Amino acid sequence: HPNLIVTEQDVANIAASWESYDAYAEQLNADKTNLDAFMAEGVVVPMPKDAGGGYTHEQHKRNYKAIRNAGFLYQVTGDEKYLTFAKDLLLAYAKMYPSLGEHPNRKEQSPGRLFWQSLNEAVWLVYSIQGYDAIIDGLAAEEKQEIESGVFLPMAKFLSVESPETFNKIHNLGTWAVAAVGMTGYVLGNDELVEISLMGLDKTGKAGFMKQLDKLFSPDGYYTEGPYYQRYALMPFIWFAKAIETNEPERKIFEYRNNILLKAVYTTIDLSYAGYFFPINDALKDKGIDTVELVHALAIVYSITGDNTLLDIAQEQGRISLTGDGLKVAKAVGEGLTQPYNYRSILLGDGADGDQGALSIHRLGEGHNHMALVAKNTSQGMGHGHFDKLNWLLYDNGNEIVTDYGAARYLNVEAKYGGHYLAENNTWAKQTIAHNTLVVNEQSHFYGDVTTADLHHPEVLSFYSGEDYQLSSAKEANAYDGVEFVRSMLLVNVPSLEHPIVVDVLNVSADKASTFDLPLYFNGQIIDFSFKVKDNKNVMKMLGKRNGYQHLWLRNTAPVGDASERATWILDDRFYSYAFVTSTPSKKQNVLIAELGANDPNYNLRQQQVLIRRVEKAKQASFVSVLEPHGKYDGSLETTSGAYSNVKSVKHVSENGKDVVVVDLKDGSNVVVALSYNANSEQVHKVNAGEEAIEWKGFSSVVV
Amino acid sequence: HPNLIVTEQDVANIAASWESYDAYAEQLNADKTNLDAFMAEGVVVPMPKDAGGGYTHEQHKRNYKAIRNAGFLYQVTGDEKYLTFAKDLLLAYAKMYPSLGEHPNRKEQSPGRLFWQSLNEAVWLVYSIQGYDAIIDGLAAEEKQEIESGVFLPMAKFLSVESPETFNKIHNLGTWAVAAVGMTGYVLGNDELVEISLMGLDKTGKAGFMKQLDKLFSPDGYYTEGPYYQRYALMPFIWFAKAIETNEPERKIFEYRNNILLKAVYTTIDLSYAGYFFPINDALKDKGIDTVELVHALAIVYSITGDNTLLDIAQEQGRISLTGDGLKVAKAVGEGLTQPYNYRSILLGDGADGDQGALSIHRLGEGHNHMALVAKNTSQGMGHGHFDKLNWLLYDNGNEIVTDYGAARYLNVEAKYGGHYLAENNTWAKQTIAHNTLVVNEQSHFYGDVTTADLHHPEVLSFYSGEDYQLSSAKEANAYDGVEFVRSMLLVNVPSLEHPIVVDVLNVSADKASTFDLPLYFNGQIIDFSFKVKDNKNVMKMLGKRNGYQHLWLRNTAPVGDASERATWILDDRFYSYAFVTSTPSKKQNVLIAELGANDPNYNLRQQQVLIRRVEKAKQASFVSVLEPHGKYDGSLETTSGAYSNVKSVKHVSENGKDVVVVDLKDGSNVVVALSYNANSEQVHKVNAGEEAIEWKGFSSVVVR
Ligand SMILES: [Zn+2]
Ligand SMILES: [Zn+2]
């Protein structure tokens, strides 16, 4: 001991070398200084009382980090003060834990004992058992017995056999539970705890860690719950794997399922823009690559692969894993081995076999400030999933441009419902109207029913990434009774323009006359609209009654017609123009400008504007649009150029289920986008857009 | 020649050493690279057509910068291609200018010819005459005569004798006009043009540059239009002065009025927080210290003073003046001479004599991210002035916390009314309700009448800056008929708390029963309120009918009473709690939460929330509050501490016109703030809270029990 996340050899290597690596030394010294200050407050182990973000919650969190850190520092420095603090913390836990029942401030989640929910209990164990592992050397036999029988064994029992609803779950909560119990099993030498963690309570392998590895990740290493929870689950995945590798290397855990864990780490990195994870499904926007789960996971993967491109990410994180694996990273960075990380367009299959929809990431441009389009054609993602099939996000110039709200939650803010998911997470954040995708009859996809949503996935029709253009196309046939919709999203390189442009074609067909809404949640300040708004008569009323509409204020409506319209806004030093036209037999076409904040008496929702394109009493519609970054605004030097859109108009024609979009540019040139929806590479297609016949081969064509 | 902003000697210094200073060299090379690219597009001088931010507007701007830069680069490098380009641009202007009438896209401002307003014409001349000065010795006599008779003399005539309404004005537009004409006078050796620029068209000194130096700055160097226009006017002030110094050093222009110009530059720096200028009066929020006016002015002042604390600011600007003076800054930074700039609390008198109210800046705490409170007890500031007597702003943690809207304007965005002040600048941005100060009967100070406002200023009652606390107190007796109000604002160092706290006491007396509103414009997301909001029933109506109220939506009302209430919000990693109580005989007290955006069909206004404290049917009220930064939120490591306010309550008692505020803290200690409003430092005062007697000496006392 230790022999889990760090080994005895690791400790020796760290002790001998840690001062020599600037990046490692900075991290350790900062952690040491913070722990010393925490130690000066004495041993503080309060009775559990508060919900998430409350004092006892955050104190017990400080304690588990201190236990792990004190354990580590005792091994590295030899200083008995760290042994004592970790020992006395654990002994205080050992005396208190057996008398604990359910937390008095529980909610709907499986309750903990130290914490309001059992998830945090598992995190406490994952950390605290590492501290214990590193502290065994300086403990008396009587102390080990008090500690094991007092906290660790009772906790491992509580989180496993006493919690089958969590321990057998194929979900990030299950991952945390099996890692906590599994790591405890390895340290305490309890074979039963290890086996049930790997193969489930009944040992058949229907649940447990191995099932999670086979079910929760696609072959590409995409985690079904989404980037934010991929990040979170990555810790118990990679740490339990580490514990398995150091104790039972014969299991070859990092080779399992064609190196799935290695792929999971790379994919986590790939699910970010400018260092922040795509906020799809339940997610917070301030979560980025320096999160500790990815810091530790990167170090482990670098140690295995020697991929010097991971060092670029390591520098961007500005943090180092205080482990043997982290030592290797620090050493490599110091030697100048860093190579740039390759951010590229990727298609990420969803579902165990990668055939249950997909997440598309389209990247175009050089450097950090490139353009990134995300097409969310994924399966539901269970309880944290949003009702937003075929949703999209746009990033450009280091900014979110076309946005996803993420979750309604204030992390560890007790006054905000114990930092837990707020009432508005379900009533607003998950709802279709809160996203950039089709809403039919003011009802969410699958009528907001998670059970129904879990049974279906979008059909990916095409993915293409080239120098000329990029494309994702998908079909959603199951979101509504008697409704089918198809969406194709393109990034187009037009040599005469400063930046790539987005082209969006969303086709909908309905058995009955319906209302079709298509929102665009934008970031920035409106410059102007091409259309005329109706006077709002000095009142804003709630937009609609249900399914998220009750959270929006109607600021203006504006009637629109056959001709394309335009909204232009500014964000930082760049302008963005949204040119849009909808082909439909219905004349009932309006643009609704809305603002977030209705039915929000607790001030839980952010300020947010949205442009919603509405078609009423229609059985069919083609929502076509162009999103164009353009121009330069410099408030420092007080200059501007290219502030007007270069798109004169957008036109759309459909013939025999095939679409042609013509983007007329102000310089007299045009861009023609054609979609056949036929996968056959060699098949020829023809469409008559009034005058001029458009002819092409394949699923798609783009001609400037 | 050159002998204006740069001299022959400056050019010699630059030529000999510019490559030796990394940042100066990088700046020069970037300018060189950018000009080479601009030159490859040829000489492009379009017939004037567009308004602010439009193509012809921005093209003529690119041209004046190109003329100046080409002139400079010709001097430093000796490369003839730069002289040729500057010459060809100027000859193209010389051909076009004589036939130009008023700009076709003018507005209410005095029109230009190249530009929609004459202001930009003056800027064009200021820049272009420098380029000409730098190439004149390399031109044939015929080329000089063509350029001078074709553009420079006609433009100088247009901006001076043909434009008395601007040239003789004591206003930043006047400063730009006299600088442009005066600099032209020096370059062309035209004594008349210099004389009228210094002394006004009639040469009597009733208007002109010297008059502007006397009137527009207070003795402390505070420019009356406010920080945003201070930095703007700083360029023609410092550059015309530089021209005066290089041509007529006997005038001792940088010594004038106890070094008023040097003081103006320091004061400009002092009017910023985290590098951005306080957005009081007409102002844009993205304007900061790297603005070229301050870059050039700083270099000039460093050259004169050798003040090494300016080198700290120079590094923070990340931009250097490509002049002889900027070379000296570059050399000094390179030699490791930088000393930290002394950001300090200051009282800045307003008016030519410093007696017309004051702007207070209070700073407390260590580092760049300290707390700064601004108390706006200033005179009107003419046309750009806002109707916001006794307004305040708060900064903390590198952020604006309690905010001023600035102006409704989108700089050089042609689709936003040619980048000009929008209709909502007058109807929203200038109005009292748009600010953190007292509004009586939903009317703006001076009933929003600039003529009336121009006649009055607040009376400064006290200013104190210590390590224990900071205080400003002022009286406004003229904003409304039959109303007087007094505001005292404090920053208090409480050793037991992690951050200083703001204490605010605003007293109002009215002859007739009135409505008193006090807004607080905050930056961040509400966590929770102590009060209970009334159901808004899924509708937000416009808050009021007039004077800015027509631009606010009412989101919620909540009743309040005798006991103090609390609002807590989060911004980045810190929480902020506003504890507030209002002492008044009236029981008609409410809090209003409002949002900006009513009567804004053009989407000209930003999203913004406000907490408004309202008292109805009152003749007297004391609005008391505490603003407390606290706690830590870390979204990366996922930790929070200290998220609850440490203020248990705030109480206020008044006796014989003297105020006592008691801030009860959760640790059982309390802060007692006492105000006598008597400037006699030795006068003893007594107030009875209930049976507890508070005793102190002087205008104010702050004691932590
Ligand atoms: Zn979402
Ligand atoms: Zn203002």
Side-chain angles (χ1 to χ4, degrees), chain B residues 279-281 386 388 404-406 429 435:
Chain B
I280 65 170
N281 297 332
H386 289 187
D388 64 335
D404 200 331
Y405 193 85
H435 296 83

Side-chain angles (χ1 to χ4, degrees), chain B residues 279-283 376 384-388 391 393 403-407 428-431 434-435:
Chain B
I280 65 170
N281 297 332
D282 285 344
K376 194 182 175 284
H384 289 303
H386 289 187
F387 298 98
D388 64 335
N391 192 31
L393 288 65
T403 65
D404 200 331
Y405 193 85
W428 167 251
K430 290 192 174 163
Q431 303 296 313
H435 296 83

Side-chain angles (χ1 to χ4, degrees), chain A residues 441 513-518 534 557-562 582-592 612-621 623:
Chain A
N441 294 341
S514 301
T515 297
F516 301 137
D517 286 327
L518 181 63
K534 179 156 74 197
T557 180
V560 296
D562 293 345
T582 307
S583 299
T584 177
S586 178
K587 314 296 184 198
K588 298 182 75 67
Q589 289 209 48
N590 295 275
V591 169
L592 315 175
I612 302 164
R613 292 152 68 185
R614 172 166 283 190
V615 182
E616 286 170 292
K617 296 181 173 179
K619 290 184 188 181
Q620 65 186 35
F623 291 87

Side-chain angles (χ1 to χ4, degrees), chain A residues 624-642:
Chain A
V624 180
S625 61
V626 175
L627 204 311
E628 169 207 9
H630 58 95
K632 300 170 179 283
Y633 164 86
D634 187 338
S636 176
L637 294 170
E638 310 202 357
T639 63
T640 188
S641 60

Side-chain angles (χ1 to χ4, degrees), chain B residues 496-573:
Chain B
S496 70
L497 301 178
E498 294 198 321
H499 310 285
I501 63 172
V502 178
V503 184
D504 177 31
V505 179
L506 198 168
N507 294 329
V508 53
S509 292
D511 285 344
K512 297 175 174 178
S514 308
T515 297
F516 302 140
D517 284 328
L518 183 62
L520 185 91
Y521 289 88
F522 65 96
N523 179 24
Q525 178 74 34
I526 292 295
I527 297 303
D528 74 315
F529 295 125
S530 61
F531 47 85
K532 51 220 178 322
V533 290
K534 302 279 183 57
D535 195 333
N536 61 29
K537 309 295 176 64
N538 310 324
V539 171
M540 298 200 301
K541 299 188 185 182
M542 181 178 74
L543 185 61
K545 291 173 198 75
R546 291 174 166 87
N547 313 315
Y549 286 78
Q550 78 274 26
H551 292 297
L552 290 161
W553 304 116
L554 181 58
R555 189 165 156 169
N556 289 110
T557 68
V560 296
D562 302 344
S564 66
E565 301 280 354
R566 176 192 52 78
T568 300
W569 66 92
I570 185 173
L571 182 66
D572 293 323
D573 66 330

Side-chain angles (χ1 to χ4, degrees), chain B residues 297-441:
Chain B
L298 182 149
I300 289 163
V301 176
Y302 182 73
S303 177
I304 295 162
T305 61
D307 179 0
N308 288 324
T309 69
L310 293 170
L311 307 177
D312 184 25
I313 304 302
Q315 295 193 241
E316 290 294 321
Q317 290 173 316
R319 179 171 284 154
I320 202 145
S321 175
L322 294 176
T323 55
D325 297 314
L327 193 78
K328 296 179 173 170
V329 175
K331 185 179 178 287
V333 171
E335 291 174 356
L337 293 172
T338 298
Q339 294 293 322
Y341 190 82
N342 183 35
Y343 285 110
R344 65 202 172 90
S345 299
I346 309 167
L347 179 70
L348 296 165
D350 198 7
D353 307 309
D355 60 315
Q356 300 179 48
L359 186 70
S360 287
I361 314 298
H362 296 281
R363 300 178 189 263
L364 214 50
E366 299 303 307
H368 303 89
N369 289 3
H370 59 266
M371 180 175 306
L373 181 146
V374 181
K376 194 182 175 284
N377 302 323
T378 49
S379 68
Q380 186 61 195
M382 318 144 81
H384 289 303
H386 289 187
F387 298 98
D388 64 335
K389 309 297 102 173
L390 278 47
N391 192 31
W392 71 296
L393 288 65
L394 184 68
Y395 293 90
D396 182 63
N397 200 35
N399 291 139
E400 55 173 13
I401 309 305
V402 176
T403 65
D404 200 331
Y405 193 85
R409 183 177 169 199
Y410 294 83
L411 186 77
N412 303 317
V413 182
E414 195 187 25
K416 289 295 208 199
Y417 193 58
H420 195 35
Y421 292 99
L422 299 160
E424 297 80 15
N425 197 60
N426 286 349
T427 70
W428 167 251
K430 290 192 174 163
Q431 303 296 313
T432 312
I433 193 55
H435 296 83
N436 310 307
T437 191
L438 178 74
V439 190
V440 174
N441 297 332

Side-chain angles (χ1 to χ4, degrees), chain A residues 497-516:
Chain A
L497 304 179
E498 297 162 288
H499 307 284
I501 61 171
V502 183
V503 185
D504 176 32
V505 177
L506 195 161
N507 300 323
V508 58
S509 190
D511 282 344
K512 295 182 168 66
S514 301
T515 297
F516 301 137

